[PDB]
Design an enzyme around this catalytic site. Structure first.
Site, PDB file in Angstrom:
ATOM      1  N   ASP A   1     -28.701  61.530  19.402  1.00  0.00           N
ATOM      2  CA  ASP A   1     -28.041  61.647  18.097  1.00  0.00           C
ATOM      3  C   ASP A   1     -26.614  61.064  18.203  1.00  0.00           C
ATOM      4  O   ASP A   1     -25.890  61.409  19.126  1.00  0.00           O
ATOM      5  CB  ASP A   1     -27.959  63.102  17.661  1.00  0.00           C
ATOM      6  CG  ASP A   1     -29.292  63.793  17.518  1.00  0.00           C
ATOM      7  OD1 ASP A   1     -30.306  63.127  17.312  1.00  0.00           O
ATOM      8  OD2 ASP A   1     -29.292  65.044  17.467  1.00  0.00           O
TER       9      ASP A   1
ATOM     10  N   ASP B   1     -36.236  64.435  24.603  1.00  0.00           N
ATOM     11  CA  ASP B   1     -37.273  63.503  24.290  1.00  0.00           C
ATOM     12  C   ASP B   1     -36.832  62.025  24.405  1.00  0.00           C
ATOM     13  O   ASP B   1     -37.573  61.135  23.958  1.00  0.00           O
ATOM     14  CB  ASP B   1     -37.874  63.829  22.883  1.00  0.00           C
ATOM     15  CG  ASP B   1     -36.897  63.609  21.723  1.00  0.00           C
ATOM     16  OD1 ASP B   1     -35.852  62.917  21.931  1.00  0.00           O
ATOM     17  OD2 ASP B   1     -37.204  64.116  20.591  1.00  0.00           O
TER      18      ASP B   1
ATOM     19  N   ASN C   1     -31.048  64.078  23.563  1.00  0.00           N
ATOM     20  CA  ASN C   1     -32.191  64.980  23.436  1.00  0.00           C
ATOM     21  C   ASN C   1     -33.140  64.772  24.599  1.00  0.00           C
ATOM     22  O   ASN C   1     -33.207  63.715  25.233  1.00  0.00           O
ATOM     23  CB  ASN C   1     -32.886  64.761  22.089  1.00  0.00           C
ATOM     24  CG  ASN C   1     -31.971  65.062  20.920  1.00  0.00           C
ATOM     25  OD1 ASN C   1     -31.310  66.121  20.874  1.00  0.00           O
ATOM     26  ND2 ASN C   1     -31.827  64.090  20.010  1.00  0.00           N
TER      27      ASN C   1
END
Length: 129
Positions: free
Chosen positions: A52, A48, A46
């Site tokens: 995952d 940010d 991701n």
């Protein structure tokens, strides 16, 4: 490892997911289908800085430690690498905590979008559990 649908269903049932906190087995198989396509080695980096991990795409900002996610917690008490293994035991244990702590399965965006409004028992059709 890429599980077959029914191989994963059987493994998840053996680890206690059928009706766990009110979610039938098909929910969990459906979630895995759309989150990872049943690939234990799936990842999603991701923007940010979190990633995952694994068959249920468990996120490193909250649930597991990958050593490289800023502003992170490790609620499942695991290295994220354990979620990339063929044996799903640790993934299941962490998924149970996610569903306890969140009072549901809304942590899984693909489950919210692709599974909730369907007959999730279809994911168990044919399967020897």
């Amino acid at each position: 490892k890429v599980y077959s649908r029914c191989e994963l269903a059987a493994a998840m049932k053996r680890l206690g997911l059928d009706n766990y906190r009110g979610y039938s087995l098909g929910n969990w198989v459906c979630a895995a289908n759309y989150e990872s396509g049943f690939n234990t080695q799936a990842t999603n980096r991701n923007t940010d800085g979190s990633t995952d991990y694994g068959i249920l795409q468990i996120n490193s900002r909250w649930w597991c430690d990958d050593g490289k996610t800023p502003r992170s917690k490790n609620a499942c008490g695991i290295r994220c690498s354990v979620l990339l293994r063929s044996d799903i035991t640790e993934a299941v244990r962490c998924a149970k905590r996610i569903v306890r702590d969140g009072n549901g399965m809304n942590a899984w965006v693909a489950w919210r979008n692709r599974c909730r409004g369907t007959d999730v028992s279809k994911w168990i059709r044919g399967c020897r559990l």
